[PDB]
């Protein structure tokens, strides 16, 4: 292609301008390029200034290539094929330019075009790059491999595909040849390329796997960081997918990776340390580690010290050698449990009590990291560590304060199982103080720590409730976005832990206004809602009637959020390319607040359901393909069925069928909530339930008889069957023979409450009506009856009837035959209570 001597002048004036000091001189020239962009012939000039025009300067030539690259990103589909084909050929001729800046620029064009433009449209690119790897000119080799690395990273899944006739079958073995090159730059590219295809179990690579391993081993000595980095990466990925082939060499690998975890370079060490985190997940960790464990624990622990750059950032960092080391230690502690303690105690002994805060801080981290795994072993030292930790809560250094909050929170359960004045109370007091610490990290650590403590403490918090509220309320005005979300968790957890004790006027007059304020500031798009509504759901359940003044605005918005979300779903479904699918977490959260509100308010919710389409929406929610949505909606169904059934009764005919299909233990929770819901429905239908029982009974029975089914599900099924039989014994009783065993085995164990009552009534009814059912397993029923400490009188009297009924009708000393295989309490419980 031929540039014009006058067009050229113009572009060089731009390039030279865009390469400038003044801010406002750049804003105008920026928008001057935005004009020229869509004119294809612009790109012809850009690539011309780069690849030709050597008389022109290097910074300007590079920028020309880099601007073109941004065009490629922005507007490449519209490039005409002759411009494109010009660029591609021009790049490839200069991929090994003598100048590093030029070379790099050309490189990134190549890789950008290869991803944006897509590989099938440059079908010679790979064999061409692969051919240039053998170039005698070093810089050409490097350049090709620079591109190849980036392409492998950007497009691995395409390469390992039918799309390009499966080129990894030559490429991978070619790459391995390059592990033995004399340039570390090229060795590194070679390994980086091959690593892109380990997790994907690329067949070319699997075939060559023992040659990959041998070749990686030969880079064990290598003393260049980027090669070490990639050998470590490789070994870590191999452990994940082909441990079978590593095993022969496992000892030598572990030796190597332990060296690299101690590496001088934090980036290499981070990649090595990942090996211990993967290895800990595998069931031969103990065997593999036996000869190195002793040294690994100190190496990990030492890696847990803050780097210097970590510290300054923290006065949102992310994943690093400290974090990785700590994660490794936490997992190892769950593997080795108390066997780890003797390795750790010598190190903790010299870190906890140390004058340099960075060292001490790391020791407190260790103490938290191993808490889960090593609890039993740790108990004897807690009486001294805990008060020590509480002292450190008021340490001068902020980062010591924050890690202290967390570590203390990791031993909450023990703290709470002791006398409350010994540890719990002082810990509370010091954590509360730190909730308003001047440092943000400490604020989040303390608020979170306190939330974890609240969960363990439950009713023990009730006496410090006014202290707790005054502090958390103030944090509402203090805390900014990140700790606010944690505050909401703390509040909601408070509410779940102290329930109705929260329902006091002064506590409400301080709490609800700031909550609502935060409600109203937020937008329905804002994910900060999730923690806020989970929070209110919890509060509402706990304030019950207290919440009335605050409910209507909240109720409506929740129902509208579900509405909104179901709408975006429909939209995305219709125009997928034009509307983004919705985040169904908004619907789940809203549905769960409405349950919390149905539960809190009972019948006081009725006036609201009466002005709502919530049942209409629930009908779509119950049919959503995401379990967690169905789960939430069946919960809400139960709740409204209890609170205000007059509004639910019209929908039962359409609901019951769907409840039918969802009695599927593929999804435990969906199934549990459906089951529960059905049961509560029955209590409201009464006899009118008769038409609907066939839809559910068989699978209720299937579930109650199914092995390895969680107990809370079994209980619910037992109770639901019970409730069906109570209102419709005729339909239910016949299958009694098939359910009475696990029904009895399940409800034996639950407390004397209203659910139990309901279910037992229903079983009593079904017995009269089909005694052939209990007879064979009638002891189970007796046992079940003896589960009751004080039955309501009328149920006691049904127990009499059935028992006398069986005692009389069988024979007044066949009873005594049968009675003598009852255990003692049972026998006597029956004798004194039922005259039997």
């Amino acid at each position: 292609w031929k540039p014009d001597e006058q067009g050229l002048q113009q572009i060089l004036q731009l390039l030279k301008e865009s390469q400038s000091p003044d801010t406002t001189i750049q804003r105008t020239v920026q928008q001057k390029l935005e004009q020229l962009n869509q004119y294809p012939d612009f790109n012809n000039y850009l690539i011309f200034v780069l690849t030709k025009l050597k008389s022109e300067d290097e910074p300007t030539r590079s920028l020309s290539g880099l601007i073109l690259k941004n065009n490629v990103k922005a507007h490449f589909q519209n490039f005409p094929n002759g411009v494109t084909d010009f660029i591609k050929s021009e790049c490839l001729n200069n991929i090994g330019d003598s100048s590093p800046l030029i070379r790099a620029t050309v490189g990134i064009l190549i890789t950008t075009i290869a991803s944006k433009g897509e590989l099938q449209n440059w079908p010679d690119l790979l064999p061409k790059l692969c051919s240039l790897l053998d170039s005698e000119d070093y810089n050409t080799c490097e350049g090709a491999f620079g591109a190849l690395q980036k392409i492998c990273e950007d497009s691995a899944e395409i390469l390992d595909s039918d799309v390009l006739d499966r080129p990894l079958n030559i490429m991978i073995p070619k790459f391995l040849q390059f592990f033995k090159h004399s340039s570390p730059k090229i060795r590194s590219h070679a390994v980086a390329c091959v690593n892109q295809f380990i997790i994907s179990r690329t067949q070319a690579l699997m075939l060559h796997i023992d040659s990959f391993i041998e070749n990686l081993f030969a880079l064990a000595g290598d003393e260049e960081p980027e090669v070490r980095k990639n050998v470590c990466r490789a070994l870590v990925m191999l452990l994940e997918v082909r441990m079978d082939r590593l095993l022969p060499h496992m000892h030598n690998i572990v030796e190597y990776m332990l060296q690299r975890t101690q590496d001088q370079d934090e980036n290499v060490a981070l990649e090595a340390c990942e090996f211990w985190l993967t290895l800990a997940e595998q069931p031969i960790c103990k065997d593999v580690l036996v000869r190195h464990l002793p040294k690994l624990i100190p190496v990990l622990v030492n890696g847990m010290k803050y780097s210097d750059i970590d510290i300054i950032l923290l006065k949102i960092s992310d994943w690093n050698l400290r974090k990785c080391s700590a994660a490794a230690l936490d997992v190892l502690a769950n593997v080795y449990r108390d066997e780890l303690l003797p390795h750790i105690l010598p190190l903790l002994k010299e870190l906890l009590f140390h004058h340099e805060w960075v060292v001490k801080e790391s020791g407190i981290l260790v103490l938290g990291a191993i808490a889960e795994g090593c609890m039993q072993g740790m108990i004897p030292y807690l009486p001294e560590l805990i008060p020590h930790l509480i002292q450190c809560l008021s340490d001068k250094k902020a980062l010591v304060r924050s890690i202290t909050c967390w570590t203390l929170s990791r031993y909450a359960h023990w703290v709470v199982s002791q006398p409350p004045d010994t540890y719990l109370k002082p810990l509370m007091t010091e954590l509360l103080k730190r909730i308003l610490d001047s440092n943000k990290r400490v604020q989040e650590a303390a608020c979170s720590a306190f939330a974890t403590l609240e969960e363990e403490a439950c009713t023990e918090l009730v006496p410090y409730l006014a202290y707790i509220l005054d502090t958390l309320v103030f944090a509402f005005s203090k805390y900014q976005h990140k700790n606010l979300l944690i505050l909401y968790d703390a509040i909601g957890t408070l509410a779940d832990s102290v329930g109705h004790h929260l329902n006091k006027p002064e506590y409400i007059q301080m709490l609800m206004p700031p909550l609502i304020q935060k409600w109203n500031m937020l937008k329905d798009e804002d994910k900060d809602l999730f923690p806020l509504l989970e929070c209110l759901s919890s509060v509402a359940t706990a304030l019950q009637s207290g919440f009335l003044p605050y409910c209507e605005p909240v109720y409506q918005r929740c129902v509208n959020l579900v509405q909104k979300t179901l709408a975006q779903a429909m939209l995305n479904n219709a125009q997928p390319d034009q509307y983004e699918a919705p985040d169904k977490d908004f619907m789940i959260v809203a549905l769960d607040l409405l349950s919390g509100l149905a539960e809190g308010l009972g019948g006081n919710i009725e006036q609201l359901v009466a002005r709502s389409n919530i049942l209409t929406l629930m009908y779509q929610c119950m049919q959503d393909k995401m379990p967690e949505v169905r789960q939430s909606s069946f919960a809400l169904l139960g709740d409204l069925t209890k609170a205000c059934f007059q509004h639910v009764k019209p929908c039962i005919a359409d609901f019951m069928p769907i409840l039918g299909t969802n009695l599927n233990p593929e999804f435990i929770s969906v199934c549990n909530n459906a089951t529960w819901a059905i049961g509560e429905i029955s209590i409201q239908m009464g006899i009118e339930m008769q038409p609907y029982i066939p839809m559910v009974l068989h699978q209720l029975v299937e579930i109650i008889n199914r092995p390895n089914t969680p107990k809370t599900l079994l209980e619910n099924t037992a109770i639901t069957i019970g409730r069906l039989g109570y209102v419709c014994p005729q339909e239910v009783a016949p299958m009694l023979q098939q359910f009475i065993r696990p029904w009895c085995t399940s409800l034996r164990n639950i407390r004397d409450n209203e659910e139990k009552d309901s279910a037992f009534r229903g079983i009593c009814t079904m017995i009269s009506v089909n005694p052939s059912g209990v007879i064979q397993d009638f002891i189970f029923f007796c046992d079940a009856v003896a589960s009751w400490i004080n039955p309501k009188d009328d149920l006691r009297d049904m127990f009499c009837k059935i028992l006398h009924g069986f005692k009389n009708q069988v024979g007044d000393e066949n009873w005594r035959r049968f009675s003598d295989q009852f255990p003692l309490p049972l026998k006597e419980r029956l004798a004194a209570f039922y005259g039997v």
């Binding site: 400290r322 700590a326 936490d330 967390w406 989040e444 979170s448 720590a449 979300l485 944690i486 968790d489």
Partner: peptide, 8 residues
């Protein structure tokens, strides 16, 4: 879902 705080 990132409302529980953790050093790792």
């Amino acid at each position: 879902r990132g409302r529980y705080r953790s050093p790792y």
